[PDB]
Amino acid sequence: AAPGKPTIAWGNTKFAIVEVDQAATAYNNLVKVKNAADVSVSWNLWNGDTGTTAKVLLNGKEAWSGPSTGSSGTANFKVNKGGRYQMQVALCNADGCTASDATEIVVADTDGSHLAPLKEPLLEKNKPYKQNSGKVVGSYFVEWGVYGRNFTVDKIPAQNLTHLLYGFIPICGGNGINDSLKEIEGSFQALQRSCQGREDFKVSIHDPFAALQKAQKGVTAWDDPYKGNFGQLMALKQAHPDLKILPSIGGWTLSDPFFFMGDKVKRDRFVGSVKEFLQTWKFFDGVDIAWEFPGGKGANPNLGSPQDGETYVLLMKELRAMLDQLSVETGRKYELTSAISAGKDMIDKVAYNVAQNSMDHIFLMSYDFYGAADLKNLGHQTALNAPAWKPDTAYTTVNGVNALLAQGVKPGKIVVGTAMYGRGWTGVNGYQNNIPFTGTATGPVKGTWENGIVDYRQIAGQFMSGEWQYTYDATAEAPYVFKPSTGDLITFDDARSVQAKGKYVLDKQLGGLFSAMIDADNGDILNSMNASLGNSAGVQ
Ligand SMILES: CC(=O)N[C@@H]1[C@@H](O)[C@H](O[C@@H]2O[C@H](CO)[C@@H](O)[C@H](O)[C@H]2NC(C)=O)[C@@H](CO)O[C@H]1O
Incomplete structure (x- = not known):
């Protein structure tokens, strides 16, 4: 038997x-x-x-x-x-x-093939849009946002994005290589611990607890191998297989190592480590290079070289070649993007007309034009155009776009940036004709998390009532709120200024819109990004 x-x-x-x-x-x-x-x-x-x-x-x-x-x-x-x-x-x-x-x-496996899809309801004021305009709709999610900000991957309004960028992946290196990190308590030391036994100029993970081990919705069981942001991002990929999830290398405080990659020995090591990173973490769809900035004027006042523009173009070309090889080894399409300064002076340090042939998208950082670092020259931090009281304003969205187009960059490459936060000053005074920007400040505005920066959620929630004035500058396409008793002045993007950017993107046949950072929106900004680019309401 x-x-x-x-x-x-x-x-x-x-x-x-x-x-x-x-x-x-x-x-x-x-x-x-x-x-x-x-x-x-x-x-x-x-x-x-x-x-x-x-x-x-x-x-x-x-x-x-x-x-x-x-x-x-x-x-x-x-x-x-x-x-x-x-x-x-x-x-x-x-x-x-x-x-x-x-x-x-x-x-x-790290494509999330073992995970149930993370398909969470939209929160706050977020409304559902279909991604049918053919335009980029992007946003950055910050690794540390899961702590005090309590903004986790399950809170991302993922159906309303084409691109989700993860900030930020560090490049290993101690003294002289990541000195900018020393300005954040414990942060330099955390990177050295993550990179112990690991060669300088290879990528790593800055906060492995947040990225992989912190319990989060859908990845709470002790023997779930991938928790934290990466585990949730894997499950998000299962829910949204067409969402592009890109790791962003660099940002303000992790950009110092790029300044050494004129040495091709280091550059080759970096590119190979990126390939290994993408072979390890299969839910990622490419790489974003957020080098701030070629030529310097980033976090580190002792870094920056005239060689940086050439290094940047070489880096993009070699990254593209690595990604093309990964693409045909896997059958997948991989994207190469970069977040760049929107100032014409900075843009002209780099030959983007050449680099664009390696890049899927250029994320034009058309924000942070003004802020509490300068208390004498006040202006709109993310306006489309110059205001009427200073039509020669250098730092505007349009001037950044025009600088790229003047080089020969194709317009479809250019993704215009919106801000999900305000920047602002306190004690503004000595202004003329009821225009607070023509005055001067005594300090930064009190911030949500850091001095001089306010989450849009808090602007909408707290600073659109009481004594606060609200003005939409239709020449610049820029809202601002002003508290006269204290001289608090905040410059930011709102639904209308985002609408102006989206219409401008469609009229000029640019690539789309992107924001920083997703945790700071209440929904108004991303809703307007989608609507203004012609995305249809509803779910597909
Ligand atoms: C061009 C751009 O993106 N904005 C710059 C700001 O980033 C920068 O402020 C710095 O912002 C970082 C995040 O983007 C923070 O990590 C950092 O603490 C902050 N440093 C400051 C306030 O000194 C400012 C600095 O002047 O320049 C902007 O242009």
């Missing part, structure tokens, strides 16, 4: 192709990429003949076979594709095969 029906033993059923060491702070030890997951199953036979061959089936297909030598057995085998499998043990002899009931096993 055929063998008795085996009973699968109680045991671990969760396995991982990319393993995460739960007691490691160094990135080199934190993650172990394998070619396949090591899977184990055991069984008992409580009634009958144990057969002569035992097999482990996954969805009916044999993954392991061996002699059946007793009433209990154990099988160890490899599974090289992530997902969920109906696993059975079968005992076979000449008279037949008898299969156990199925037990589901989970084989994790």
Whole structure:
């Protein structure tokens, strides 16, 4: 007669192709990429003949076979594709095969193939839009926003984006390489710990707890291998396979290492580490280069060289070549983008007419034009045009776009930036004709999280009532609020100024809109970005 029906033993059923060491702070030890997951199953036979061959089936297909030598057995085998499998043990002899009931096993991989889709309802004022304009709708999500700001990946209005950028991936390096980090308490030391045993100029993860280990919605079970931002982003990819999720390398305080990549030895090491990063973290769709900035004038006053423009073009070309090779190895399309200064002086340090041939999108940082770092020259921080009281204003969105177009950049490459926050001053005084910008300030406005910067959510929630004046400058296309008693003045984007940017993008056939940072919106800004670009309301 055929063998008795085996009973699968109680045991671990969760396995991982990319393993995460739960007691490691160094990135080199934190993650172990394998070619396949090591899977184990055991069984008992409580009634009958144990057969002569035992097999482990996954969805009916044999993954392991061996002699059946007793009433209990154990099988160890490899599974090289992530997902969920109906696993059975079968005992076979000449008279037949008898299969156990199925037990589901989970084989994790960093594409999120093991995860249920993270499809969360829209929050606050966010309304559903379909991505049918063909325009970029992008936003940056910051790794540290999960702490005080409490803004996690499940709160991203993901259906209302084409591009979600993750800020920020650091480049390893200690003294002289990441000195800008020393201005943030504990941050330099955190990077050195992540990069222990890891060569300078390879990428790493700045906050592995936030990125991979903090419990979050959908990834709370202790043996879920990927938690934190990355685990949730994997599940988000399962819900939105057309969403492009890009890691952004650099930003204000992690840009110092770019200034050394004129040395091709370092540049080659960096590019190879980016390829390895994308082979490790499969939910990412490319790379964003947020080098602030070629030529200097970023966080570090001691960095910046006339060579930087050439280094930038070489970097984009070599990144594109690496991504093209990754693309044909995987069958996937990979994107290369960059966040760049919107000032004409800065733009003309780089030959974007050449670099554009390597790049899918240029994220034009048409914001932070003015702020509390200068208390004497006040202006709109993210306006489309110059205001009427100073038509020669240098730093406007249009002047940045025009600088790119004058180089020969194709307009469809250019993604215009919107601000989900205000910048502002306190004690504004000595202004003429009821225009506070013509005065001077005594300090920064009190911020939501940092001096001089206010979340748009708080502008809308607190500074659009009481004594606060509200004015929409229709020449510049820029709103501002002013508290006369204290001289508090805040410049920001609102639904109308975003609408002007979106219409301007359509009229000039630019690439779309993007924002920083997604956590600071209440929905008004992203709603207007979508509507003004012609995205249809509703869900597709
Ligand atoms: C061009 C641009 O994006 N804006 C610059 C600001 O980033 C910069 O302020 C700095 O902003 C960073 C985040 O973007 C912060 O991490 C950093 O603490 C902050 N540093 C400051 C306020 O000194 C300012 C600095 O003058 O320049 C803008 O142009």
